[model samples]
Target: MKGDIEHKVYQLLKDQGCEDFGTKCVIEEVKSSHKTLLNTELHLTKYYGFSFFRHGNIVAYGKSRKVANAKYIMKQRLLKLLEDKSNLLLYSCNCKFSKKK
Candidate 1:
């Protein structure tokens, strides 16, 4: 499942010239914050890993933020929907028989 989505997205990005096809912009980590944990005995501040971009034009200053999944974001921004597991498996068969370039 993971491989299917990842491979499809990889090919999509490369073919579209977003990043892998050669571009300055690439998906990156943006922001992070600390959280207090250890409800039992000790309290601790831990980093909640997150990424962001302070869009210079509009405005971006935040107290909190979060992201669910990477693939969803990429596909949404690029206006492309990645194929499913079945598609990958089927195409893999064709690739096996086809000549490499």
Candidate 2:
């Protein structure tokens, strides 16, 4: 789902004009104190790896914080955000100029 990650980033960037805000704000990480192991010693004990926006925003943190599944988790988060009509109205705009209209 690397492609999906790219799509989400693209959506937030060129599509949303995030740069216009003076920062290409995407996802930013939280403090290390917020991190924890996915499981205890009883299980495989994987650290909850998460990624943040280079600027200062939130992406998504899955059970496993490893880069392996981060993309999938990000996709799920983005899909959820994109699907919410109320949230969409505030996050995404449709006021751009379109001569066809």
Candidate 3:
């Protein structure tokens, strides 16, 4: 799933003629003692980060940064990738937790 999402975002950026953008994927699984504000237990494999940028400028970013939320960053990347700002209206997927919840 991570590979697919990364590839799709990369392709979208390429198609949009976005230069200086880079995509990286990191994965790790382990056990830890941590929790989020939502009270969700933080287990090891429950973290991830997918960062995208252009010329050192962050058009959009996600992830907990300090915690386990790589999924969050990936979601942000996808949103930015699919967003069409020509109309100035924010659009996103219904399944997107950041947008829906």
Candidate 4:
């Protein structure tokens, strides 16, 4: 789910002429044992989660949770980070998910 959401967000940015967006690094320490894909790099954690003090200035955050749907949440977060005000273009994609039954 996390990786899919990330990819969707990345695709959205790329479609909007955003070429500077890319994965910085991968965080291995805080990775979940059950969910390896959700674990991100330390730099991403700082960029997305916690605020760190450096050079007497606050660094900008990347993606943060703000919506219930995973895709929409990621989209909103990325938009906020880019300070983009344009409306998001919608597209339909066929996706599958697994459920414990």
TM-score of each: 0.23, 0.42, 0.37, 0.25
Clashing residue pairs in candidate 2 are: 27-52, 27-53, 27-57, 28-53, 28-57, 49-65
Badly placed stretches (over 4 Å) of model 3 are: 1-3, 24-50, 65-68, 80-101
What number of backbone clashes does candidate 2 have, counting pairs of residues 3 or more apart or in separate chains?
A: 6
Rank order (by TM-score, best first): 2, 3, 4, 1
Please write out the lDDT profile of model 4 over residues 2-99, one tens digit for every residue: 44434554566456444343332222233334433545442332223322111223222333332233234444554453345423322222223232
lDDT (10s digit) by residue, model 3, range 1-101 = 34454565556555544434554544444446554565554444443445555545444444443443665555555554455442111233222234433
- Count steric clashes of candidate 1: 2
The alpha-carbon lDDT assigned to residue 27 of candidate 2 equals: 32
Encode model 1's per-residue lDDT on 1-101: one tens digit a residue.
24343354456544433332111223333324344345442423322222222112111111212333433343333222243333221222221235343
Candidate 1, superposed: residue stretches over 4 Å from native = 4-7, 20-43, 50-101
| Top candidate, metric lDDT | 3
Check candidate 1 and list the clashing pairs. Answer: 30-51, 30-52
lDDT value, candidate 4, whole model: 0.36
lDDT of every predicted structure (CA atoms): 0.30, 0.44, 0.47, 0.36
List the lowest-lDDT window of 10 residues for candidate 3. 87-96
RMSD of each: 13.0, 8.9, 12.7, 16.8
Predicted structure with the largest TM-score when compared to the true one: 2
